[PDB]
# Entry
Amino acid sequence: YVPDEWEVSREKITLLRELGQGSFGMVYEGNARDIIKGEAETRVAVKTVNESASLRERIEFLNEASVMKGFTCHHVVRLLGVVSKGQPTLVVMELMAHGDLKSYLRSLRPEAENNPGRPPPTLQEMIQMAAEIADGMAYLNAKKFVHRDLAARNCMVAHDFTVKIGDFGMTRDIYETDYYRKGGKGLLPVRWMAPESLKDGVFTTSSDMWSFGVVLWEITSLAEQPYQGLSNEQVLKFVMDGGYLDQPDNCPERVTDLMRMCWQFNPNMRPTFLEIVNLLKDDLHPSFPEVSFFHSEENK
Amino acid sequence: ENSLVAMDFSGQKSRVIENPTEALSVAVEEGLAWRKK
Ligand SMILES: [Ca+2]
Ligand SMILES: [Ca+2]
# Structure
């Protein structure tokens, strides 16, 4: 790594509370000073990277950081600053009060010790999450990028409950060819991957679109472990053969439909993130077109 | 609860690495393999 237009003065960052015992480092919430030229102090999210991390995680960290530097979408966790000056390194992101979606969902489970006092997401709320994530994904693809790691565990939930994309360690550039092909050995999110990706190690927007579907399944099932009861080995075979997860109990027919779409075995039958957002535009909170990339002018 | 899995695409057919000790090696290697670029 090497400094640039971000690298913020460490003396401007204060770590208040811890919000996640990562293994590669951690995630703290804190307050900052003079980040947004116009505001004195602003509360942020701070993701650290252990000094003594993994030869592998490090890279996937900077990738995440870097890749973010070019994004600007209401639905894609905003990057604020970096700090390579002395271990541990920091990536200052906008604070997503309610944590990652997986955890947020897992906390809606009635059996939950850390329950928020409310029921699981309702059809409306889902459609909302669906479109926001979809949008964020749409934007991402537009800036020529394939995520490869879409999952509730990588989506963040803001204070007001807006869902956004927040982890980018596995993201790859596709401006060139519009796809990514895994070379050799590596670690991949098998349970979220599409048949072709499973089969040929090829990642496209459609594969992300497939994952999208899985994320819906995660939501509609409060983050169950996809293909639970199936061995990593068995899951490959099962999905490459044309298998897909089952609708959870009481699953909104309308979200089921969305999943049947995302799980089309033939990648070209799967919708686009935009076609999705479009398919929903009518039933969303009013503050959507103001912020949405879909309704933005940058979409043309 | 695990998330990532070790695989290998070098070769006609796909493959989720089956040997415990080999699969556990993938990690470090995917790392170096990237250093080179
Ligand atoms: Ca990461
Ligand atoms: Ca990650």
In short: Residues 1-95 of chain A form a domain with the Phosphorylase Kinase; domain 1 fold (CATH 3.30.200.20).
